């Protein structure tokens, strides 16, 4: 049972708090550029090439442009079948929280 966390942002503190959670909770967290499609398409790969059942969490930071939101909408629709869930984060507190519940709780 491998859990994956894919974070869409380019921050210092946020990426810290996000990965610090993953490191201590043995979660596979990968930093994604601020584009939502990139993350989900990688999630599809990670889930695909994963031996056994996995759980993928994608965290989009901040506000999504119409295009980005449209991508994230269709991508999440598909990603649902890959056992992936996408959540929006604004502060590292939210990110840490979503990772906490997703971790083992």
User: Containing H/E element for 39?
Assistant: helix 36-48
Sign of the four-CA dihedral 79, 105, 49, 62:
positive
Distance CA 57, CA 45 (A): 14
Is 56 in a helix, a strand, or coil?
Answer: strand
Which CATH number is associated with domain 2-101? Answer: 3.40.50.960
Experimental method: NMR
Is residue 34 within 8 A of residue 8, CB to CB? The reply is: yes
- In the chain, what are the domain boundaries? 2-101
- Given the DSSP bridges, would you call strands 2-8 and 28-32 parallel, antiparallel or unpaired? parallel
């Amino acid at each position: 049972m491998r859990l994956v966390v894919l974070i869409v942002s380019n921050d210092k503190k946020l990426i810290e708090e996000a990965r610090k959670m993953a490191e201590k909770a043995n979660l596979e967290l990968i930093t994604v550029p601020g584009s939502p499609e990139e993350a989900i398409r990688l999630a599809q790969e990670i889930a695909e090439k994963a031996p056994g059942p996995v759980k993928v969490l994608v965290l989009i930071t901040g506000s999504a442009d119409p295009d980005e939101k449209t991508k994230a909408k269709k991508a999440a629709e598909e990603a649902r079948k890959w056992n992936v869930r996408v959540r929006t984060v604004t502060s590292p507190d939210e990110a840490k929280r979503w990772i906490k519940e997703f971790s083992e709780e």
